Amino acid sequence: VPFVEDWDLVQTLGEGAYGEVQLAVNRVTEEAVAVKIVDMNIKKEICILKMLNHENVIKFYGHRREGNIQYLFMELASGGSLFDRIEPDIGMPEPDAQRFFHQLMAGVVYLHGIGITHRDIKPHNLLLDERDNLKIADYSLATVFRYNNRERLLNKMCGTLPYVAPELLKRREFHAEPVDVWSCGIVLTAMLAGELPWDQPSDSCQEYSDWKEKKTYLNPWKKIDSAPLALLHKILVENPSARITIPDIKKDRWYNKPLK
Numbered sequence: 001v002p003f004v005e006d007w008d009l010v011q012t013l014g015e016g017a018y019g020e021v022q023l024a025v026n027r028v029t030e031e032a033v034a035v036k037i038v039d040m041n042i043k044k045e046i047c048i049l050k051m052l053n054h055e056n057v058i059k060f061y062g063h064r065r066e067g068n069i070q071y072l073f074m075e076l077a078s079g080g081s082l083f084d085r086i087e088p089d090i091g092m093p094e095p096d097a098q099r100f101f102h103q104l105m106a107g108v109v110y111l112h113g114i115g116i117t118h119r120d121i122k123p124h125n126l127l128l129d130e131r132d133n134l135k136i137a138d139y140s141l142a143t144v145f146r147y148n149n150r151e152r153l154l155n156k157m158c159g160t161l162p163y164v165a166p167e168l169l170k171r172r173e174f175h176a177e178p179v180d181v182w183s184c185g186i187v188l189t190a191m192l193a194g195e196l197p198w199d200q201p202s203d204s205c206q207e208y209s210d211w212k213e214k215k216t217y218l219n220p221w222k223k224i225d226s227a228p229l230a231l232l233h234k235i236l237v238e239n240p241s242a243r244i245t246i247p248d249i250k251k252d253r254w255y256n257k258p259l260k
Protein backbone atom coordinates (compact mmCIF):
# COMPACT_ATOMS: atom_id res chain seq x y z
CA VAL A 1 0.00 0.00 0.00
CA PRO A 2 1.47 3.47 -0.90
CA PHE A 3 2.10 6.11 1.88
CA VAL A 4 2.92 9.86 2.34
CA GLU A 5 5.00 10.82 5.43
CA ASP A 6 2.71 9.54 8.30
CA TRP A 7 -0.36 8.60 6.10
CA ASP A 8 -1.40 5.37 4.28
CA LEU A 9 -3.24 5.70 0.89
CA VAL A 10 -5.82 2.85 1.24
CA GLN A 11 -8.46 3.36 -1.54
CA THR A 12 -9.62 5.59 -4.42
CA LEU A 13 -12.63 7.82 -3.57
CA GLY A 14 -12.57 9.63 -6.97
CA GLU A 15 -10.85 9.43 -10.40
CA GLY A 16 -11.17 12.85 -12.17
CA ALA A 17 -9.20 14.70 -14.92
CA TYR A 18 -7.32 16.53 -12.06
CA GLY A 19 -5.50 13.47 -10.55
CA GLU A 20 -6.93 10.89 -8.04
CA VAL A 21 -8.42 11.43 -4.53
CA GLN A 22 -7.41 8.77 -1.95
CA LEU A 23 -8.58 7.88 1.57
CA ALA A 24 -5.49 8.58 3.80
CA VAL A 25 -5.33 6.99 7.33
CA ASN A 26 -2.62 8.10 9.84
CA ARG A 27 -1.27 4.55 10.84
CA VAL A 28 -0.50 5.93 14.40
CA THR A 29 -3.61 8.02 15.31
CA GLU A 30 -6.18 6.46 12.86
CA GLU A 31 -7.43 9.92 11.54
CA ALA A 32 -8.96 9.43 8.04
CA VAL A 33 -8.66 12.32 5.51
CA ALA A 34 -8.86 12.64 1.70
CA VAL A 35 -5.75 13.36 -0.40
CA LYS A 36 -5.82 14.79 -3.95
CA ILE A 37 -2.77 13.47 -5.94
CA VAL A 38 -1.69 15.86 -8.80
CA ASP A 39 1.16 14.75 -11.19
CA MET A 40 2.61 18.31 -11.64
CA ASN A 41 -3.12 26.81 -11.94
CA ILE A 42 -2.32 24.68 -8.78
CA LYS A 43 -0.57 27.68 -7.07
CA LYS A 44 -4.05 29.39 -7.33
CA GLU A 45 -6.20 26.36 -6.27
CA ILE A 46 -4.11 25.88 -3.03
CA CYS A 47 -4.38 29.66 -2.29
CA ILE A 48 -8.23 29.46 -2.59
CA LEU A 49 -8.30 26.18 -0.58
CA LYS A 50 -6.38 27.84 2.30
CA MET A 51 -9.11 30.59 2.46
CA LEU A 52 -11.92 28.03 3.10
CA ASN A 53 -13.42 27.79 6.56
CA HIS A 54 -17.17 26.86 6.72
CA GLU A 55 -19.21 23.76 7.78
CA ASN A 56 -20.65 23.38 4.17
CA VAL A 57 -17.27 23.74 2.33
CA ILE A 58 -14.51 21.03 2.21
CA LYS A 59 -11.68 22.09 4.67
CA PHE A 60 -8.03 22.21 3.46
CA TYR A 61 -5.50 20.60 5.90
CA GLY A 62 -2.30 21.40 3.90
CA HIS A 63 -0.14 20.02 1.04
CA ARG A 64 3.22 18.23 0.43
CA ARG A 65 5.38 18.30 -2.77
CA GLU A 66 7.29 14.97 -3.35
CA GLY A 67 9.11 15.30 -6.71
CA ASN A 68 6.45 15.98 -9.42
CA ILE A 69 3.52 14.84 -7.16
CA GLN A 70 1.59 17.49 -5.13
CA TYR A 71 -0.54 15.96 -2.30
CA LEU A 72 -3.55 18.14 -1.15
CA PHE A 73 -4.90 17.00 2.26
CA MET A 74 -8.62 17.84 2.69
CA GLU A 75 -11.60 17.05 4.92
CA LEU A 76 -13.01 13.54 4.21
CA ALA A 77 -16.75 13.26 3.35
CA SER A 78 -17.52 9.56 4.09
CA GLY A 79 -21.18 9.78 2.95
CA GLY A 80 -20.34 9.95 -0.79
CA SER A 81 -21.98 12.57 -3.08
CA LEU A 82 -25.44 14.08 -3.60
CA PHE A 83 -25.35 12.36 -7.04
CA ASP A 84 -25.79 8.95 -5.24
CA ARG A 85 -28.87 10.25 -3.28
CA ILE A 86 -30.71 11.18 -6.50
CA GLU A 87 -32.93 8.37 -7.87
CA PRO A 88 -33.11 8.57 -11.70
CA ASP A 89 -36.50 9.84 -12.86
CA ILE A 90 -37.67 10.24 -9.19
CA GLY A 91 -35.25 12.53 -7.33
CA MET A 92 -35.64 12.34 -3.52
CA PRO A 93 -38.15 13.25 -0.78
CA GLU A 94 -38.87 17.03 -0.90
CA PRO A 95 -37.84 17.51 2.81
CA ASP A 96 -34.36 15.99 2.06
CA ALA A 97 -34.04 18.14 -1.10
CA GLN A 98 -34.99 21.21 1.00
CA ARG A 99 -32.36 20.44 3.69
CA PHE A 100 -29.61 19.86 1.06
CA PHE A 101 -30.68 23.11 -0.71
CA HIS A 102 -30.45 25.06 2.65
CA GLN A 103 -26.88 23.67 3.15
CA LEU A 104 -25.90 24.41 -0.49
CA MET A 105 -27.08 28.03 -0.10
CA ALA A 106 -25.13 28.40 3.24
CA GLY A 107 -21.99 27.13 1.41
CA VAL A 108 -22.46 29.38 -1.66
CA VAL A 109 -23.24 32.52 0.51
CA TYR A 110 -19.99 31.72 2.35
CA LEU A 111 -17.91 31.44 -0.87
CA HIS A 112 -19.52 34.58 -2.41
CA GLY A 113 -18.82 36.44 0.89
CA ILE A 114 -15.01 35.75 0.64
CA GLY A 115 -15.26 36.72 -3.11
CA ILE A 116 -14.82 33.10 -4.43
CA THR A 117 -16.95 31.61 -7.28
CA HIS A 118 -16.98 27.75 -7.50
CA ARG A 119 -18.03 27.71 -11.27
CA ASP A 120 -18.93 23.96 -11.33
CA ILE A 121 -21.75 23.33 -8.84
CA LYS A 122 -23.32 19.96 -9.63
CA PRO A 123 -24.24 16.88 -7.58
CA HIS A 124 -20.86 15.10 -8.13
CA ASN A 125 -19.18 18.19 -6.45
CA LEU A 126 -21.59 18.18 -3.45
CA LEU A 127 -20.24 15.61 -0.93
CA LEU A 128 -21.94 14.31 2.26
CA ASP A 129 -20.28 13.79 5.70
CA GLU A 130 -21.29 10.87 8.06
CA ARG A 131 -24.33 12.98 9.23
CA ASP A 132 -25.44 13.78 5.59
CA ASN A 133 -24.15 17.35 5.87
CA LEU A 134 -23.43 18.82 2.42
CA LYS A 135 -19.87 19.99 1.60
CA ILE A 136 -19.09 21.93 -1.61
CA ALA A 137 -15.95 20.19 -3.05
CA ASP A 138 -13.46 20.59 -5.95
CA TYR A 139 -11.88 24.10 -6.20
CA SER A 140 -10.02 23.25 -9.41
CA LEU A 141 -12.23 25.72 -11.44
CA ALA A 142 -12.82 28.20 -8.54
CA THR A 143 -11.68 31.84 -9.02
CA VAL A 144 -11.70 35.24 -7.30
CA PHE A 145 -14.49 37.55 -8.53
CA ARG A 146 -14.18 40.17 -5.68
CA TYR A 147 -10.93 41.58 -4.23
CA ASN A 148 -10.41 44.75 -2.15
CA ASN A 149 -14.22 45.05 -2.38
CA ARG A 150 -14.13 45.45 -6.25
CA GLU A 151 -15.98 42.97 -8.47
CA ARG A 152 -14.31 41.61 -11.62
CA LEU A 153 -16.49 40.16 -14.42
CA LEU A 154 -15.58 36.66 -15.64
CA ASN A 155 -14.94 35.84 -19.34
CA LYS A 156 -13.60 32.21 -19.16
CA MET A 157 -16.33 29.72 -20.20
CA CYS A 158 -16.14 26.68 -17.86
CA GLY A 159 -18.38 24.32 -15.90
CA THR A 160 -20.68 21.51 -17.10
CA LEU A 161 -23.08 22.34 -19.99
CA PRO A 162 -26.37 21.12 -18.37
CA TYR A 163 -25.56 23.20 -15.23
CA VAL A 164 -24.23 26.39 -16.94
CA ALA A 165 -26.19 29.64 -17.08
CA PRO A 166 -27.17 30.91 -20.55
CA GLU A 167 -25.16 34.20 -20.21
CA LEU A 168 -21.97 32.07 -20.10
CA LEU A 169 -22.74 30.82 -23.67
CA LYS A 170 -23.91 34.27 -24.96
CA ARG A 171 -21.92 37.10 -23.26
CA ARG A 172 -18.25 38.10 -23.62
CA GLU A 173 -18.25 38.99 -19.87
CA PHE A 174 -20.67 38.17 -17.03
CA HIS A 175 -21.18 38.37 -13.24
CA ALA A 176 -19.95 35.33 -11.21
CA GLU A 177 -22.74 35.13 -8.56
CA PRO A 178 -25.79 34.66 -10.88
CA VAL A 179 -23.95 31.75 -12.69
CA ASP A 180 -23.50 29.88 -9.35
CA VAL A 181 -27.20 30.67 -8.45
CA TRP A 182 -28.36 29.16 -11.82
CA SER A 183 -26.35 25.91 -11.26
CA CYS A 184 -27.97 25.61 -7.76
CA GLY A 185 -31.40 25.81 -9.57
CA ILE A 186 -30.38 22.94 -11.90
CA VAL A 187 -29.20 20.99 -8.77
CA LEU A 188 -32.60 21.64 -7.13
CA THR A 189 -34.40 20.41 -10.33
CA ALA A 190 -32.23 17.18 -10.32
CA MET A 191 -33.03 16.56 -6.57
CA LEU A 192 -36.83 16.97 -7.09
CA ALA A 193 -37.17 15.23 -10.54
CA GLY A 194 -34.12 12.89 -10.87
CA GLU A 195 -33.56 14.34 -14.37
CA LEU A 196 -31.81 17.37 -15.91
CA PRO A 197 -34.10 19.74 -17.81
CA TRP A 198 -31.86 20.36 -20.92
CA ASP A 199 -28.47 19.57 -22.53
CA GLN A 200 -27.68 23.31 -22.36
CA PRO A 201 -29.62 26.59 -22.01
CA SER A 202 -29.21 27.61 -25.70
CA ASP A 203 -31.96 28.88 -28.13
CA SER A 204 -31.19 25.74 -30.29
CA CYS A 205 -32.24 23.49 -27.32
CA GLN A 206 -35.98 22.60 -27.59
CA GLU A 207 -36.25 21.73 -23.83
CA TYR A 208 -34.85 25.17 -22.90
CA SER A 209 -37.29 26.89 -25.40
CA ASP A 210 -40.14 24.90 -23.81
CA TRP A 211 -39.20 26.25 -20.33
CA LYS A 212 -38.94 29.81 -21.65
CA GLU A 213 -42.48 29.27 -23.15
CA LYS A 214 -43.60 28.04 -19.66
CA LYS A 215 -44.62 24.52 -20.78
CA THR A 216 -44.41 23.19 -17.17
CA TYR A 217 -46.89 20.38 -18.07
CA LEU A 218 -43.75 18.72 -19.55
CA ASN A 219 -41.02 16.80 -17.63
CA PRO A 220 -39.17 17.43 -15.46
CA TRP A 221 -41.41 20.29 -14.22
CA LYS A 222 -44.69 18.27 -13.98
CA LYS A 223 -42.98 16.08 -11.27
CA ILE A 224 -42.28 19.18 -9.10
CA ASP A 225 -44.77 20.59 -6.57
CA SER A 226 -46.04 24.19 -7.24
CA ALA A 227 -44.04 25.67 -4.29
CA PRO A 228 -40.46 24.55 -5.26
CA LEU A 229 -41.49 25.08 -8.93
CA ALA A 230 -42.30 28.77 -8.24
CA LEU A 231 -38.73 29.13 -6.78
CA LEU A 232 -37.32 27.40 -9.92
CA HIS A 233 -39.26 30.05 -11.97
CA LYS A 234 -37.24 32.80 -10.13
CA ILE A 235 -33.83 31.01 -10.32
CA LEU A 236 -33.89 29.79 -13.95
CA VAL A 237 -34.43 33.32 -15.45
CA GLU A 238 -32.46 33.90 -18.67
CA ASN A 239 -31.49 37.54 -17.89
CA PRO A 240 -28.89 37.34 -15.03
CA SER A 241 -29.82 40.91 -13.78
CA ALA A 242 -33.51 39.82 -13.37
CA ARG A 243 -32.50 36.43 -11.80
CA ILE A 244 -33.25 36.03 -8.06
CA THR A 245 -30.34 36.72 -5.65
CA ILE A 246 -29.55 34.52 -2.69
CA PRO A 247 -30.94 37.14 -0.18
CA ASP A 248 -34.33 36.85 -2.04
CA ILE A 249 -34.07 33.00 -2.29
CA LYS A 250 -33.89 33.11 1.54
CA LYS A 251 -37.35 34.91 1.54
CA ASP A 252 -38.98 32.39 -0.89
CA ARG A 253 -42.13 30.60 0.35
CA TRP A 254 -40.83 27.05 -0.37
CA TYR A 255 -37.39 27.89 1.11
CA ASN A 256 -39.14 28.76 4.41
CA LYS A 257 -41.78 25.94 4.31
CA PRO A 258 -41.59 23.52 7.28
CA LEU A 259 -41.24 19.96 5.80
CA LYS A 260 -41.19 16.30 7.19
Ligand SMILES: CN(C)c1ncnc2nc[nH]c12
Binding pocket: 013, 014, 021, 034, 058, 074, 075, 076, 077, 078, 127, 137
Ligand atom coordinates in the same frame (compact mmCIF):
# COMPACT_ATOMS: atom_id res chain seq x y z
C1 LIG B 1 -14.82 11.79 -4.13
N1 LIG B 1 -14.04 12.84 -3.49
C2 LIG B 1 -13.47 13.86 -4.35
C3 LIG B 1 -13.96 12.93 -2.15
N2 LIG B 1 -14.50 11.94 -1.42
C4 LIG B 1 -14.51 12.02 -0.07
N3 LIG B 1 -14.02 13.08 0.57
C5 LIG B 1 -13.47 14.09 -0.14
N4 LIG B 1 -12.90 15.27 0.27
C6 LIG B 1 -12.47 15.93 -0.82
N5 LIG B 1 -12.80 15.21 -1.89
C7 LIG B 1 -13.41 14.05 -1.48
Ligand SMILES: [Cl-]
Binding pocket: 086, 190, 194, 195, 196
Ligand atom coordinates in the same frame (compact mmCIF):
# COMPACT_ATOMS: atom_id res chain seq x y z
CL1 LIG C 1 -29.89 13.81 -12.42
